[PDB]
Structure 1
Amino acid sequence: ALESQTIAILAKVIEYLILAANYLNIKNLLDLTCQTVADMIKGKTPEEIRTTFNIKNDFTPEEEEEVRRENQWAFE
């Protein structure tokens, strides 16, 4: 109340997006949001994810394929 050793929009910060929790240094809440974001992802394809954010691909199939190969052949 007092926390972010960044200290030491008001939104729900006081009644307790990540940006910036981050900020201002509220360790615990970073964990609150980062874990639920992480869920946004667990079990989603790379497309499914980049859809549901706004990262458009910047992988030219040359590389996009070569990665998918390493990933699957060697790391799964």
Structure 2
Amino acid sequence: KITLKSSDGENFEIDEAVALESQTIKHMIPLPNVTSKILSKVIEYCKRHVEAAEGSSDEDLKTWDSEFIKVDQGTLFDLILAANYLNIKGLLDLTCQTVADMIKGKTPEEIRKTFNIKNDFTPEEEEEVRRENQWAF
């Protein structure tokens, strides 16, 4: 039984064993960076993983993970930030797999367009990077 407060100031409570899934929290709680929504998402993830810890159940957990993964771009970015901050392997890995599936896409115009990435390659550098990876094209 531990109490976690977020930027919203809500003293979200969770069990000690469930909160132990975060290495940063276990080592050391204002938590000025993690937002209330993202903190609630990590709390739900930790609760579900603790329930699973205490196959058919394995694939049910994977399906629940896939359902929870369905969030927009900003939510996924914030989830990655929070997972990196709080030292959670599973959540960071799941978000990384989702982003990898997203970037498994088309020619570089697609990747630069979906992520609003603004490339500024010099013409020499752009052409050279195209030639040095010609095997893929």
TM-score, with structure 2 as normaliser: 0.48
Gaps of 5+ in 2: 1-18, 26-37, 46-78
Q: What is the deviation of 1:44?
A: 2.3
Gaps of 5+ in 1: none
Q: What is the deviation of 1:34?
A: 0.3
| Cα deviation 1:27-53 (Å, max 9, x = unaligned) | 111110000101111132222111111
One of 116, 120, 124 as aligned partner of 1:62: 124
| Cα deviation 1:3-57 (Å, max 9, x = unaligned) | 33222x3131111121121111001111100001011111322221111113200
Identity of aligned residues (%): 96
For 1:74 and 1:40, the matched residues in 2 are separated by: 19
For 1:69 and 1:33, the matched residues in 2 are separated by: 32
Structure 1 runs, 4 residues or longer, greater than 6 Å off: none
SS of aligned partner of 1:58: coil
More helix per residue? 2
Rg comparison, structure with higher value: 2
TM-score, with structure 1 as normaliser: 0.81
Instruction: Please provide the CA RMSD for this pair.
Output: 2.0
